[PDB]
Design a protein around this ligand. Sequence first.
Ligand SMILES: CC1=C[C@H](O)CC(C)(C)[C@H]1/C=C/C(C)=C/C=C/C(C)=C/C=C/C=C(C)/C=C/C=C(C)/C=C/C1=C(C)C[C@H](O)CC1(C)C
Ligand SMILES: CC1=C[C@H](O)CC(C)(C)[C@H]1/C=C/C(C)=C/C=C/C(C)=C/C=C/C=C(C)/C=C/C=C(C)/C=C/C1=C(C)C[C@H](O)CC1(C)C
Ligand SMILES: CC1=C(/C=C/C(C)=C/C=C/C(C)=C/C=C/C=C(C)/C=C/C=C(C)/C=C/C2=C(C)CCCC2(C)C)C(C)(C)CCC1
Ligand SMILES: CC1=C(/C=C/C(C)=C/C=C/C(C)=C\C=C\C=C(C)\C=C\C=C(C)\C=C\C2=C(C)CCCC2(C)C)C(C)(C)CCC1
Lengths: 98, 44, 201, 39, 209, 738
Amino acid sequence: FANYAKAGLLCGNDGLPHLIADPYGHAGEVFIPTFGFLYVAGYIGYVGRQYLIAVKGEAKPTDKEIIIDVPLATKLAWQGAGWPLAAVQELQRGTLLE
Amino acid sequence: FIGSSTNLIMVASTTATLAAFTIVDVLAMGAAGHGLGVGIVLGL
Amino acid sequence: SLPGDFGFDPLGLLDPVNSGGFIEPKWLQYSEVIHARWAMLGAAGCIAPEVLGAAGLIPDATNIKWFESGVIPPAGSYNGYWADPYTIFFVEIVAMQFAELRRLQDFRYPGSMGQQYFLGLEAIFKGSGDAAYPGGPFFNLFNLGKTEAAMKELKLKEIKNGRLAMLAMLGYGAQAVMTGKGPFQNLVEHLADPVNNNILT
Amino acid sequence: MKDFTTYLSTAPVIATIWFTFTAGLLIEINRYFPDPLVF
Amino acid sequence: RPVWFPGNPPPAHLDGSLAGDYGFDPLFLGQEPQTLKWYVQAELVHGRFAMLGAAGIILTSIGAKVGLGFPEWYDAGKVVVEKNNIDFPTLMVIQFYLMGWAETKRWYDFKNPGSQADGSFLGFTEEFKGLENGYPGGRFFDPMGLSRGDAAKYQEYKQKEVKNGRLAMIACLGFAAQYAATGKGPLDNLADHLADPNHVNFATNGVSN
Amino acid sequence: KVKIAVDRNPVETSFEKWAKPGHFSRTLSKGPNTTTWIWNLHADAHDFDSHTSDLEEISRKVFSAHFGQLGIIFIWLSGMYFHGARFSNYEAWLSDPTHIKPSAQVVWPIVGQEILNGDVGGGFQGIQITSGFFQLWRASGITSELQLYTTAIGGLVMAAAMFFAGWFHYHKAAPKLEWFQNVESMLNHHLGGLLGLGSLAWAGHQIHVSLPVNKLLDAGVDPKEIPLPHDLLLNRAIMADLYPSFAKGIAPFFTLNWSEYSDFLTFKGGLNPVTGGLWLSDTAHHHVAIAVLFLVAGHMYRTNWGIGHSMKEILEAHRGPFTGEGHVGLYEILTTSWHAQLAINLALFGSLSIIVAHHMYAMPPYPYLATDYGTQLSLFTHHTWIGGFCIVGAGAHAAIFMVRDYDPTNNYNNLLDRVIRHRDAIISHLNWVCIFLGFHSFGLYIHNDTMSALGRPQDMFSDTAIQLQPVFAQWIQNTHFLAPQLTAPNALAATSLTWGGDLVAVGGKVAMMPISLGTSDFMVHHIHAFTIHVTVLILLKGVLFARSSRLIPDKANLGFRFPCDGPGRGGTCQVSAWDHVFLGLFWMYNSLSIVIFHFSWKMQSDVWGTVTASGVSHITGGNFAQSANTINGWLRDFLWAQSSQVIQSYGSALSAYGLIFLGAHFVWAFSLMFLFSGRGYWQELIESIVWAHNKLKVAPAIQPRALSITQGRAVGVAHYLLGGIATTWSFFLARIIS
Ligand SMILES: CC1=C[C@H](O)CC(C)(C)[C@H]1/C=C/C(C)=C/C=C/C(C)=C/C=C/C=C(C)/C=C/C=C(C)/C=C/C1=C(C)C[C@H](O)CC1(C)C
Ligand SMILES: CC1=C[C@H](O)CC(C)(C)[C@H]1/C=C/C(C)=C/C=C/C(C)=C/C=C/C=C(C)/C=C/C=C(C)/C=C/C1=C(C)C[C@H](O)CC1(C)C
Ligand SMILES: CC1=C(/C=C/C(C)=C/C=C/C(C)=C/C=C/C=C(C)/C=C/C=C(C)/C=C/C2=C(C)CCCC2(C)C)C(C)(C)CCC1
Ligand SMILES: CC1=C(/C=C/C(C)=C/C=C/C(C)=C\C=C\C=C(C)\C=C\C=C(C)\C=C\C2=C(C)CCCC2(C)C)C(C)(C)CCC1
């Protein structure tokens, strides 16, 4: 309770903290977290993209969806840290779309 | 122990059932007479 | 081919057609013998104090029943020992680990225990092709059964003293649970009044 | 053990060795930073 | 040749070529030859740290059991810290830097034979060579040059080193499981056992452990 | 010549096949092209008959599979003991049963879950268990946790041994077909060793450990102060003191003076008044008799000596005029088909688990069982379920035999043939009887609802207005309470208080009391009997026409598990035996659900409650007889009124039940998506989504495919059951605990 009073959330006639979702009194409620997600989700997605494409050219790709090449994935895992800088550059370059 | 109405009946029921022969027949009709006799003693 | 064969197998165990695991001719002749050899140790070992003590050679302390020695604490434990019964059981485990597993490695590989050094004894522990009957200067110092005939008969002699001593142990136990006395106190009391000191009583 | 490791790198095994990791991580962070509605 | 479990033959992947090779990998861990090249260094370092550590306790402990000055290995970290000027967090961080450096360089010799050899450092070229996975040698690691002496003389030491290594690793963990079960120093655990060995065992207090 | 036959080392033990999913079939071994592969390999994982034609390999697989199962179950049993030792209130519970709630689960302190650790007594904070272990433990004579720990470690070892056993008997020493076919020997050994020596040795535990320790506890003496159960063995002075006949030892046994053992081997019946459970003495004598019965029974069949019956002989003997050749051919079937055996065994197990529920309902065999209403409702509902499922399974496999194993040419059987030749009469008659039953059961409730709505209570089916008395049942109840006087003289009280009088109560709560039977009970039983008959209709129809019908004569070739044979013949949706099992599961759920609702309402209204000044206040005040005659009464007096405690369970220890209450509705409703739809839609949906993937170069190699029609049905029924059952589960437990 003390740590929402220090955070300074808006509490209604209910007595419960409601949230603010547009602009700057209450940025951290949604506006910051929001990026958090789009990053880590974009991270997961782009790693998964770089895996499936990296397999694609190897006779039978379907085996690598099941008996997953772990040491391939764990290298793509770290590579997928800087993904928006790659994701942008790939949209530029024009290898992003079929 | 070789005396009472418990034993008198047990020995009578065994020799009666056996009279009605290799290895397998004796242990069967012996367990018949004992399978018989026990109820007579726990009865009377 | 096995000694002690008087043809007694109601339960088709030694039948070699489609055998597996521990229902193996080679295996069971082994067990029976090692069983025999232990059983004879236990038979003579369980009674000896009760006898020799009664004989008045052994002091008042030592002259205990077999189950009062500290094997089964609730039935009685001894005191006057080099140590407690658990500091013993460890000295046992290490030894019986060595001397049972070695014996397993002759069973598993005939030649083995001959090659890999063991303080000069590796020379001794060569085996005899037959597992149960290893021999050599360690386990046959007097080179007895010098002929194939005299051996086969000694192998006859062994199994029968054994089988007897195994039943004797089945004796001393089943006897001790019902009596609550040692099978030598049971024997002398049975010499004194055969019909009063009995199962039926 | 080339074979044993391929099995450990099977889909259902990886998923589980991955989820116990990203579950712990989220239980862990909720311990030392308890009860978040901001950050 | 001699083996861990006499009679049972040793597994193929063990040649009798490596120091302390007694056909012992009952769990097929070090089968793929690279993953064993990795374990032969873990084992060496583990044993070298364990040896320094065992020598490290075995001398403090007699030093404490010879004159009432030195502290017991358990409560001898705080005694170093509190008494003397120094802090914990920084040591722990300083350590991590130096050990970090020292390791991160050994780290890139496992994957690359003669990597750090390139002089890419302080011009020190020939001192950071390969040689043999586990023995780096040169003027630093083997100053006296037993490394560059004789074929047999050095082969026998590999043997000595791994064995002492494996005994110190045991020894160390006893120190650690003996303080635990009895709450005393390893020359109080040793004095109590010499005076009355038949009674002062595990059988008393030290359970199955 | 019944003998030990084994193959040596039939299968090597390296991980070469682990690393190859779907090794077991030539089809799946090729790998996945589509995602359907993934499902198939789990679907057919245990289906050994389709893998191989060799009955040997199948036979080796099946029990090793059973050793694995038994290992798992031991590990499970190990679990409960350990927690009962480590994380429980049992010692606190072994000192004031009445005022401590049984608990053997603790939550960790994170994420608000702490609230689940409720005020359960004995100075311990936790989850109240309803498994009934605490009473088992008291019945077994367990006094301290240490004992529970030791039992736990033993179960873990046994788990290891069973796992070892299962690897062994497949990889080192796999038994030969001959072996598995020694039915007479198997039967004899299972009857005499397993059941016989099992209950004999147990009865040993009961006579040497349970009976003494129980009397001292019921006496009231502190459990810590109670002598240890081995000292009862070596000091029989304590046993002599507790029951006198021990002084004479095993002499009265051999001399046939058994009447001297009347101290601890009784026939009293009723309940122990101080504990609300059956006499342990009755139970000890029960197991003693049963052991002898089974032991002698297990010496019926011929083995390695002339003596004994042969199964085939008894079967071939038993024939008559109406049936023709009768039982002939059945032995050969039941020695070559696992499915047929599975079918038999599931029917009778299932039936057994339900009779176990009832008999445990009516005759609480454990201490302070009866008065732990949570435990009693949990156990009866549980055991009623698993029975339910097993019975449907019996039907399923019966059909599987019917399709895959039946071969008249090779293995002829006439009973079966005659059954097949008049199936139409059987199914038509079952149809009729079911419509009958449906009308004259449901119709009665609708009639009542209408009369009640139209203001005509005097015209209703009820004790007040209409009387439909259970005259037979009342007769049998009459005969049961008068039996101890006439037909069972040596028996002191009745088997159960729900027949006799003598209302026995413990700790101010009702343990048991006479159950009145009126019109409402007349109703619900006939509903049941309706539901069972419908379920039987579906499943029997399924099994009898599995092979062929008028629509699809060659159904047998198409399989046990298959969707349809197209929109032809007017449309052939759900023709397969599987689909019958499918629909059978829903009706089974229906039937079983009314039973447990019947149980819960019955118990709270007419039986359970508190005991005041020479009088009884029931939990729901005897509303049953008057309310359960209309649908509205269930809707309101049972559902609506009782759901109160679950719906406000928030903010408490019971809140998890509210969460599971909602979650189970969710999952139930979620099933309907699968049940109501078809994969045609889903596959096109998937076409569009796949487009989207391909557009961004994120298409999978394993081609995404909608579930099969069959899988859609399986997922549907599974989520339907899980949702329904879990909702009733959260309901009862929160209700009865609060
Ligand atoms: C063969 C056959 C055939 C067909 O087919 C069928 C049938 C008939 C069934 C089968 C069977 C038979 C039989 C019965 C057998 C038996 C055996 C035995 C009993 C053994 C023992 C065996 C036994 C044994 C070894 C034993 C041993 C022992 C010992 C060492 C002892 C020790 C001791 C001593 C001294 C002292 C201390 O204080 C104590 C102790 C520690 C204790
Ligand atoms: C190897 C070798 C080598 C080289 O070359 C040479 C040499 C050295 C000589 C050798 C050695 C040897 C040896 C060691 C031996 C041993 C033996 C024994 C001990 C036996 C026993 C043996 C033993 C035995 C039989 C035993 C038996 C017993 C019996 C019957 C018993 C009886 C009884 C009973 C039950 C009961 C009662 O109440 C009592 C009585 C009456 C008492
Ligand atoms: C009647 C009859 C018959 C037969 C039948 C039979 C075949 C029967 C059988 C029966 C049997 C076959 C039985 C058995 C039984 C057994 C038992 C009853 C057991 C018991 C046990 C116990 C109680 C023990 C205990 C102990 C002691 C006391 C001490 C030490 C330890 C021991 C554990 C050993 C015939 C057909 C001929 C004819 C017609 C009629
Ligand atoms: C700010 C904000 C807001 C608003 C927002 C909005 C209004 C938005 C819009 C938006 C939009 C209007 C969007 C659009 C989009 C488009 C497109 C066209 C997309 C695309 C995508 C893609 C192409 C992706 C890719 C990828 C990646 C990158 C990674 C992972 C994998 C993947 C392949 C998925 C709110 C108030 C709510 C809250 C607060 C803040």
